[PDB]
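Bug report (template v2)

What were you trying to do?
Predict the complex of my protein with genistein.

What happened?
Run completed; filing so the output is reviewed.

Input:
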Amino acid sequence: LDALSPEQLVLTLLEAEPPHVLISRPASMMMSLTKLADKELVHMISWAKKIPGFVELSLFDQVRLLESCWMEVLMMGLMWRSIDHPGKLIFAPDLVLDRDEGKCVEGILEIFDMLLATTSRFRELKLQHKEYLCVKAMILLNSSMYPLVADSSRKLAHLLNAVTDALVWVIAKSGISSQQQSMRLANLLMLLSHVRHASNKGMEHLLNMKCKNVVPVYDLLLEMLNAHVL
Amino acid sequence: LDALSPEQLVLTLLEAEPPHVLISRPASMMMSLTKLADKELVHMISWAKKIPGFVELSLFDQVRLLESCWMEVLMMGLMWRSIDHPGKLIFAPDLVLDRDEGKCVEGILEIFDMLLATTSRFRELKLQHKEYLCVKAMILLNSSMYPLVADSSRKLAHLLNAVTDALVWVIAKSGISSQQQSMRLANLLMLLSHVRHASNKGMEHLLNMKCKNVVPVYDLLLEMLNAHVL
Ligand SMILES: O=c1c(-c2ccc(O)cc2)coc2cc(O)cc(O)c12
Ligand SMILES: O=c1c(-c2ccc(O)cc2)coc2cc(O)cc(O)c12
């Protein structure tokens, strides 16, 4: 029970943060974004396994959550990396793209603008480091409704409730009024729907891409998940 | 300021609820769903105009919110209508479909299952009538980030904050602990991302449909919005 205690949970999530990922480049923008995502997924899996209680979930729930959440978690990390730089998306060290470079690939400008506007909202709310760590973990745990709708099910609700309690604790430490605490929790959680919207649009765009101009991220992810079951 | 007061706001939303809509039927499932949506949009516009402060927003914000939110608001009303009936989707009086009827149209079963699982989550949480009225209005107001990221912008934040305060008031009246209040607010708002996910999948499916087997809902909606500007 103390591993899921707020201060301790926050500090555990801080140490599970993924490393810096480089594209390390030797049709090009899409190849770079998909190659980058495949490299980051490796570390996302590692991060998930470090969230207190995640590996105590059934294997079925662990895999369903990872397969559903990947673009959302990737995009939430992108938004945190780009928070202090209006008009820029810091995909990686590295791979810094300006909004206007989205004009070169059909369908991408729309996705860049949604990403930049969501990032702007988190900048305006002055998202804290401790709040970002809770939110990103909530994105993985709230990704698939199925796992919630028995032993493993009880557990997922409990785990999502503990991260939420941590977020509530972080907001209370800010010293603001009870009304303002309630409002800040609502403003942050309403933004989760905008991160989900971006991920859905990104996935739709990727699925509409011609196979030759892209790394097959999803199939590579499934191989990773099979590789981690065996 | 008292029009946006919690008890009064809830009671105003209750009276702005749309009427029952019938398909009134004289390739068929998709025609029925799209004909139904076009009829409901007429009343959705009317409902929006009755939410305190909505018509005080700039015309640009009113139209952007309506164009972005339509499938989400339609689907949240569907989920409320179907809440007490596992395995059934009560699209309208009527037009009651069983989960298995989704098997007949390609791509629809996936959307029916997401709708039925989200509906199941709201049933498990025992969503109250007063909570549903606040949530549906929050779905319209949180639909587009753009309008938030000056006079009309200030206003949208204020309006979204008032509905949120109403929801917080409703949850507090339930008598549960402060921790439980925080947790219930989080559980409901996290479900908004699942309603957004369903709407995105529904829109993608509709856009992939062959024009002859569907009513052109979106173009009809734009005509309604132009018809209401003029
Ligand atoms: O944003 C992305 C990303 C992406 C990559 C790394 C990140 O950290 C975040 C997103 C990957 O593939 C795409 C593929 C697409 O077709 C469209 C997209 O917007 C993306
Ligand atoms: O669910 C819907 C609805 C719909 C209709 C009425 C409602 O109250 C809610 C959703 C309309 O068009 C679609 C069109 C689609 O291609 C797929 C869908 O799932 C839908």
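What did the reviewer find?
Residues B 33-34, 36-37, 40, 74-75, 77-78, 91, 111, 202, 205-206, 209 surround genistein (ligand 2) (CB under 6 Å). Chain B has eight helices and two strands.
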